[PDB]
Curated annotation (Swiss-Prot):
It holds the Pfam family Kunitz_BPTI. Signal peptide: none annotated. This is Kunitz-type serine protease inhibitor homolog alpha-dendrotoxin. It is found in: Secreted. Serine protease inhibitor homolog that blocks voltage-gated potassium channels (Kv1.1/KCNA1, Kv1.2/KCNA2, and Kv1.6/KCNA6) (IC(50)=0.4-150 nM) and facilitates neurotransmitter release. It comes from Dendroaspis angusticeps. CDD domains: Kunitz_dendrotoxin. InterPro entries: Kunitz_BPTI, Kunitz_BPTI_sf, Prtase_inh_Kunz-CS, TFPI/VKTCI-like.
Length: 59
């Protein structure tokens, strides 16, 4: 599947009040998608740019 195991993690915004535009890898759809990261919490399936998501999880 994806290149790394962090790529399978379920998307998680965390529990803070910010809304930071980021990407995560969507295993089910096989693509990088947008989400808003809250500023704390979350898991390592989160990238600042789509390019970063793509290289890391897709190639």
């Amino acid at each position: 599947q994806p290149r790394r195991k962090l790529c399978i993690l379920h998307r998680n915004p965390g529990r803070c009040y910010d809304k930071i535009p980021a990407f995560y890898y969507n295993q089910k759809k096989k693509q990088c998608e947008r989400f808003d990261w809250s500023g704390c919490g979350g898991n390592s399936n989160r990238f600042k740019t789509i390019e970063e998501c793509r290289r890391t999880c897709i190639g």
